[PDB]
């Protein structure tokens, strides 16, 4: 039961913009993103 929150300082779970690239800059972008420090939902699987 390890909590794994979203760390935006490593850009976790971020979809890259399609059709283009940027180099050595910083900008704002509107899209579909996860919340910062979202724990999410964990799924644990076992052998039978």
């Amino acid at each position: 039961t390890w909590p794994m929150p979203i760390d935006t300082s490593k850009a976790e779970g971020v979809i890259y913009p399609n059709g283009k690239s940027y180099s050595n800059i910083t900008l704002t972008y509107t899209g579909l993103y996860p919340k910062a420090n979202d724990l999410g939902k964990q799924y644990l699987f076992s052998d039978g």
């Binding site: 059709g19 283009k20 690239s21 940027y22 180099s23 050595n24 800059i25 900008l27």
Partner: protein, 214 residues
Amino acid sequence: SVCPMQALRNDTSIEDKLDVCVEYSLHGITGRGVFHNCTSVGLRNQRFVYDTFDNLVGYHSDNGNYYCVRPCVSVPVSVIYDKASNSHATLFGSVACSHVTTMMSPGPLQTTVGCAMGFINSSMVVDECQLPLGQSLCAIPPTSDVFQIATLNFTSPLTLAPINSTGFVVAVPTNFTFGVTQEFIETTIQKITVDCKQYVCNGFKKCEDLLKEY
């Protein structure tokens, strides 16, 4: 891209037309600009590189090279006119004279503010200018056949040196004149009132009925 078949032109190359303003159609993307061979930046599978203003700045080509892309640029031009001789000359600012000869369609003279056309090199030194060019350069009009380049240059006149004694040396006047310094101070401007409805609608009742809202 998705393209209709009637808009498909064949193909060209860039390697023989670098550093000039061209039109481009690169995988559906169209535009105008200057291409320069560069070192690869960005991700090469995304094939286009943009800036923060979403203008195209780079392109990964099918031939394997990366190109920096700029918009089309222009050389700045300055005209030097003297009304007494009815004469003129030209300065291309921030341009080296070795590049004026290539895009051309007394010789061109390189100065610290660019490439001058219609000027002769001179050794003249003045301390007053009416046609200054910047960086202590001054243009002297014909009375020769062309304009001359001279320099603004002056320094402090007389350097009295202290004597090696127990007193000192002082320069005391033995003759004089009266000089006049003139000066102007503004105290006022011209005072204006505006008829706003007359300025906007100029008579014309239909404009005034639309202007009742404002």
